[PDB]
Design a protein around this ligand. Structure first.
Ligand SMILES: [Zn+2]
Lengths: 51, 365, 64
């Protein structure tokens, strides 16, 4: 479960740079490795690499 | 037997009859050699043996210490007692010696000028037998458990390699292409064996308790998966259709190539119709093996009845392939026997075991 | 100090198990994969690293 935006607000900063919340960054990490792992398990990948 | 000679002279029986009957009688009279010895050079257990297919004179032996010894089996002396002297040796001082145990060594079929050796050092080396130098090396990402060249291929010269990876590698000795792999296993591939009958048929046995037959030309995976029950316990193929209830750590096609003998870690050997993988339900009783790596066992050739010599603890169990009847135990080794190789010319046997000995079994009288 | 060691003969990681028979002052190191076995004397201060040490030393000495 991805939480909504209010649990992880993207606070705006003195300029226009929108700083994201720690949860958003972490979901970025989970998403990237999930997508990358998905393409490996879908394809041929070493069992230790999949592990 | 004088009846056999008389029938051969009088034409009553084809000489085929005497030849195969006497071959069978010689195999049944297999015993510890009275007047023969094999030179001892391996510092560790012998994991594999291979007598060359043409002229059956020279024997390769790979030891757990990584050295490869090349013996001459012919009694070039005049005495009745002789030792199979070692002609050549990839010893510890050779620049290309295997760093770890040599697990399979195989003469190149069709010619004795080349052989191959695979090791747990993740290498399949191709050696020129004359210069005794590595003609080629194939490196693998994971340790090699077994390899095999086709004993029949006049066209292709592929080496099927089974490593702890779940993929069967096919290394082309013609221009070096080790990229080809076969998908469909799930754990370490403990044994591989080309069909002696069909050029492109390869049987692979892996720790996932499955044995698969592949037509390596084909693009659609394995041809047949061997199933103990042939369909009694039928399920969508994800985990069913297992050859054994353990790791299948040994393969051997029969002499004609119409059947396949698989030995697994469930203490069972099974005989399979090599054309559709149907289990022939030959019993064989309990065949004790607990080897965590490939188990090398061979079948007899040129006899009235086919025999299979399986390492059985510290012994060699001789079974009749098509009936399963237990012939005998060759009992002369002090530790577990790793390999046995059958000399078909004279119905002789050479067994290598963990006790750093290669023992020769010869027919008595 | 790890108790499972890579085998010098088959290079299989953590495939070597060490048994300390203190009553007989002997350590036995055996590879599960290639079934290579080695026996060395041990003392009460000895450890599996010392048994694997004696095995590596015996291998290198025998390979000279
Ligand atoms: Zn080992």
């Amino acid at each position: 479960p991805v939480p909504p935006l209010s649990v992880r607000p993207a606070v705006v900063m003195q300029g226009s740079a929108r700083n994201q919340d720690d949860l958003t960054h972490k979901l970025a990490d989970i998403v990237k490795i999930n997508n990358q792992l998905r393409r490996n398990e879908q394809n041929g990948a070493a069992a230790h690499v999949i592990a | 037997m004088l009846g056999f000679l008389s029938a051969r002279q009088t034409g009553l029986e084809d000489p085929l009859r005497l030849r195969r009957a006497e071959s069978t009688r010689r195999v049944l009279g297999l015993e510890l050699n009275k007047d023969r010895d094999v030179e001892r050079i391996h510092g560790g257990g012998i994991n594999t043996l291979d007598i060359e297919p043409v002229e059956g004179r020279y024997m390769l032996s790979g030891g757990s210490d990584g050295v490869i010894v090349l013996y001459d089996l012919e009694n070039s002396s005049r005495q009745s007692y002789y030792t199979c002297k070692a002609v050549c040796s990839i010893g510890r001082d050779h620049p290309d010696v295997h760093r770890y145990s040599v697990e399979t060594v195989q003469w190149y079929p069709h010619d004795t000028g080349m052989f191959t050796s695979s090791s747990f050092d993740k290498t399949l080396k191709v050696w020129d037998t004359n210069t005794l130098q590595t003609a080629d090396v194939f490196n693998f990402e994971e340790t090699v458990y077994s390899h095999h060249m086709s004993p029949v291929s006049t066209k292709h010269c592929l080496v099927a390699v089974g490593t702890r990876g779940p993929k069967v590698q096919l290394c082309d000795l013609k221009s070096g292409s080790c990229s080809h792999i076969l998908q469909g296993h799930r754990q370490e591939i403990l044994a591989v064996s080309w069909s002696p009958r069909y050029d492109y048929i390869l049987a692979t046995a892996s720790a996932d308790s499955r044995v698969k037959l592949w037509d390596v030309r084909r693009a659609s995976g394995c041809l047949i998966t061997l199933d103990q029950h042939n369909g009694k316990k039928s399920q969508a193929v994800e985990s069913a259709n297992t050859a054994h209830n353990g790791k299948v750590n040994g393969l051997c096609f029969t002499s004609d190539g119409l059947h396949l003998l698989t030995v697994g870690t469930d203490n069972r050997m099974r005989l399979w119709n090599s054309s559709n993988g149907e289990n022939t339900l030959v019993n064989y009783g309990k065949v004790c093996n607990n080897s965590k790596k490939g188990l090398k066992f061979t079948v007899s050739c040129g006899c009235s009845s086919e025999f299979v010599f399986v390492p059985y603890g510290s012994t060699i169990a001789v079974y009749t392939v098509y009936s399963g009847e237990q012939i005998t135990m060759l009992k002369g080794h002090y530790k577990t026997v790793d390999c046995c190789v059958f000399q078909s010319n004279f119905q002789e046997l050479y067994s290598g075991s963990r006790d750093c000995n290669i023992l020769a079994w010869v027919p008595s009288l | 100090l790890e108790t499972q060691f890579t085998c010098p003969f088959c290079n299989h990681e953590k495939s070597c198990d060490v048994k300390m028979d203190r009553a007989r002052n002997t350590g036995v190191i055996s590879c599960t994969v290639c079934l290579e076995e080695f026996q060395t004397p041990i003392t009460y201060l000895s450890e599996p690293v010392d048994v694997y040490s004696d095995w590596i030393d015996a291998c290198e000495a025998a390979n000279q």
